[PDB]
Short mmCIF file of C-alpha atoms and ligand atoms in Angstrom, two decimals:
data_model
loop_
_atom_site.label_atom_id
_atom_site.label_comp_id
_atom_site.label_asym_id
_atom_site.label_seq_id
_atom_site.Cartn_x
_atom_site.Cartn_y
_atom_site.Cartn_z
CA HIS A 1 94.92 77.11 134.90
CA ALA A 2 93.10 80.42 134.23
CA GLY A 3 93.34 81.15 130.62
CA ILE A 4 95.32 80.11 127.61
CA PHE A 5 95.19 82.73 124.95
CA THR A 6 97.75 82.32 122.30
CA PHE A 7 98.02 82.63 118.74
CA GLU A 8 98.12 79.57 116.51
CA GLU A 9 100.83 81.32 114.42
CA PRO A 10 103.22 84.12 115.47
CA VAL A 11 103.75 85.07 112.00
CA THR A 12 101.23 85.29 109.33
CA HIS A 13 101.56 86.37 105.83
CA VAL A 14 98.67 88.06 104.20
CA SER A 15 98.38 89.71 100.85
CA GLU A 16 98.09 93.43 100.33
CA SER A 17 95.26 92.68 97.85
CA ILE A 18 93.19 91.15 100.61
CA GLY A 19 90.30 92.96 102.54
CA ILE A 20 90.10 91.29 105.86
CA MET A 21 92.69 89.02 107.37
CA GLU A 22 91.61 86.70 110.16
CA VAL A 23 94.08 85.03 112.56
CA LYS A 24 93.10 82.13 114.83
CA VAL A 25 93.33 82.58 118.57
CA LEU A 26 93.18 79.52 120.82
CA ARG A 27 90.59 79.72 123.63
CA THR A 28 91.22 79.15 127.48
CA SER A 29 90.86 75.50 128.47
CA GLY A 30 88.94 76.99 131.42
CA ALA A 31 86.18 78.48 129.51
CA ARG A 32 83.38 78.72 131.97
CA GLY A 33 82.56 82.32 131.60
CA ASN A 34 83.00 85.54 129.71
CA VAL A 35 86.45 86.82 129.50
CA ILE A 36 87.65 90.03 127.57
CA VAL A 37 90.96 90.09 125.71
CA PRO A 38 91.93 93.50 124.47
CA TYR A 39 94.30 93.68 121.26
CA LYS A 40 95.93 96.30 119.28
CA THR A 41 97.80 96.64 116.11
CA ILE A 42 101.38 98.01 116.40
CA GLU A 43 101.86 99.75 113.16
CA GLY A 44 105.60 99.19 113.07
CA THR A 45 106.28 100.06 109.42
CA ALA A 46 102.69 100.12 108.34
CA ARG A 47 100.28 103.05 108.99
CA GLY A 48 96.92 102.95 110.59
CA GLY A 49 94.09 105.22 110.43
CA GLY A 50 93.02 103.84 107.10
CA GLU A 51 96.35 104.90 105.48
CA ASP A 52 98.06 101.59 104.75
CA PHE A 53 95.92 99.45 106.97
CA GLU A 54 93.00 99.98 109.09
CA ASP A 55 94.35 99.74 112.55
CA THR A 56 92.38 97.95 115.14
CA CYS A 57 92.40 98.15 118.95
CA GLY A 58 89.39 96.41 120.57
CA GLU A 59 88.41 93.61 122.52
CA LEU A 60 87.95 90.00 121.82
CA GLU A 61 85.07 88.58 123.79
CA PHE A 62 85.30 84.93 124.73
CA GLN A 63 82.61 82.97 126.37
CA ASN A 64 81.95 79.51 127.45
CA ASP A 65 79.72 79.13 124.40
CA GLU A 66 81.87 81.29 122.16
CA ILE A 67 84.84 79.26 120.92
CA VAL A 68 88.02 80.35 119.20
CA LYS A 69 88.33 83.93 117.86
CA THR A 70 89.76 85.81 114.82
CA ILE A 71 91.36 89.15 114.70
CA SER A 72 89.80 90.82 111.74
CA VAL A 73 92.06 93.52 110.28
CA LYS A 74 91.40 95.56 107.18
CA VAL A 75 94.24 96.20 104.78
CA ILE A 76 94.23 99.38 102.73
CA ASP A 77 95.64 100.24 99.42
CA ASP A 78 98.95 102.06 99.44
CA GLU A 79 99.00 105.70 99.94
CA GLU A 80 102.86 106.45 100.02
CA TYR A 81 105.15 103.99 98.25
CA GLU A 82 104.93 100.41 97.96
CA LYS A 83 106.82 97.83 100.07
CA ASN A 84 105.98 94.72 101.97
CA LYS A 85 105.15 96.10 105.38
CA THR A 86 104.24 94.52 108.67
CA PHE A 87 102.30 95.27 111.75
CA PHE A 88 102.33 93.31 115.13
CA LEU A 89 99.22 92.10 116.73
CA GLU A 90 99.50 91.87 120.46
CA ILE A 91 96.84 91.14 122.97
CA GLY A 92 96.72 92.65 126.40
CA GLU A 93 95.53 91.58 129.67
CA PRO A 94 92.41 89.37 129.75
CA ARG A 95 89.95 89.89 132.44
CA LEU A 96 87.18 87.92 133.65
CA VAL A 97 83.90 89.86 133.01
CA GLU A 98 82.32 88.02 135.78
CA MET A 99 84.66 89.02 138.49
CA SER A 100 85.21 86.07 140.81
CA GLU A 101 84.36 86.86 144.33
CA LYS A 102 87.22 85.36 146.07
CA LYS A 103 86.59 85.58 149.74
CA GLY A 104 89.86 87.12 151.01
CA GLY A 105 88.04 89.21 153.45
CA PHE A 106 87.83 92.87 154.34
CA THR A 107 90.95 94.70 153.17
CA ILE A 108 91.86 98.33 153.16
CA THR A 109 91.55 99.90 149.80
CA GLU A 110 89.23 97.84 147.49
CA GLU A 111 88.90 100.08 144.58
CA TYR A 112 88.97 99.56 140.84
CA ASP A 113 92.55 99.04 140.47
CA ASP A 114 94.07 95.99 138.75
CA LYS A 115 94.13 98.08 135.65
CA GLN A 116 97.84 97.12 134.91
CA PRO A 117 98.33 94.42 132.32
CA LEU A 118 100.55 91.37 132.72
CA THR A 119 103.21 93.15 134.40
CA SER A 120 104.22 91.37 137.46
CA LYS A 121 107.91 91.22 136.87
CA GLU A 122 109.38 92.71 139.92
CA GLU A 123 106.17 92.99 141.99
CA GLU A 124 105.50 89.59 143.31
CA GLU A 125 102.29 90.69 145.03
CA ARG A 126 100.62 91.59 141.71
CA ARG A 127 101.23 88.00 140.79
CA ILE A 128 98.73 86.99 143.46
CA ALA A 129 96.16 89.04 141.58
CA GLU A 130 97.17 87.80 138.23
CA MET A 131 96.80 84.22 139.58
CA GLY A 132 93.19 84.79 140.12
CA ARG A 133 92.73 86.36 136.79
CA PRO A 134 92.93 84.88 133.35
CA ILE A 135 96.23 85.43 131.51
CA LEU A 136 97.69 84.71 128.17
CA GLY A 137 99.07 81.50 126.66
CA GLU A 138 102.31 80.56 125.03
CA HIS A 139 102.99 82.84 122.14
CA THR A 140 101.45 86.26 122.11
CA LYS A 141 102.86 88.11 119.18
CA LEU A 142 101.54 88.13 115.71
CA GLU A 143 103.81 89.58 112.91
CA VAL A 144 101.61 90.07 110.15
CA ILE A 145 103.78 90.51 107.02
CA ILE A 146 101.48 91.94 104.41
CA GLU A 147 103.10 91.06 101.28
CA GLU A 148 102.07 92.85 98.25
CA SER A 149 100.35 90.63 95.70
CA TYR A 150 102.66 88.24 93.99
CA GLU A 151 101.79 84.70 94.96
CA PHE A 152 101.69 83.09 98.23
CA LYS A 153 104.16 80.33 99.81
CA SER A 154 106.75 82.44 98.10
CA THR A 155 108.02 84.17 101.31
CA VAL A 156 109.21 81.26 103.10
CA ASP A 157 111.29 81.75 106.36
CA1 CA B 201 101.54 102.37 102.26
CA1 CA B 202 101.29 98.17 98.48
#
């Protein structure tokens, strides 16, 4: 295929009394090399910067030897007023660190472009490139509902 990077759960409930929450990411079935998957915390109704939570935007490094992955996010103690709040974890465009030399041939303008994420919506030609790159899996969205300490299994949807 290319890459299958999806969350095991699209919604996760974590306590506000927790330190680090970790979420399981499923790895590509074509793990034959090193692939970088950037991710970021969309604040939403939470506040990053160590305010309400410790926001994170970095890169998950997948390898042939490195299996699975967890996004480790730090939750902070409330600074403003307390509510159950939530932040979205989304991953970006994965890229092969080992850039596959696909022999297309000499072409005009071969620079470091390809900086756009998964965005081939109207541009069909960018799909050619995305086809030779890894992409995401099924559901890439993680709604982390950080529920203030009560008890778990209570917030059932
Ligand atoms: Ca707060
Ligand atoms: Ca709180």
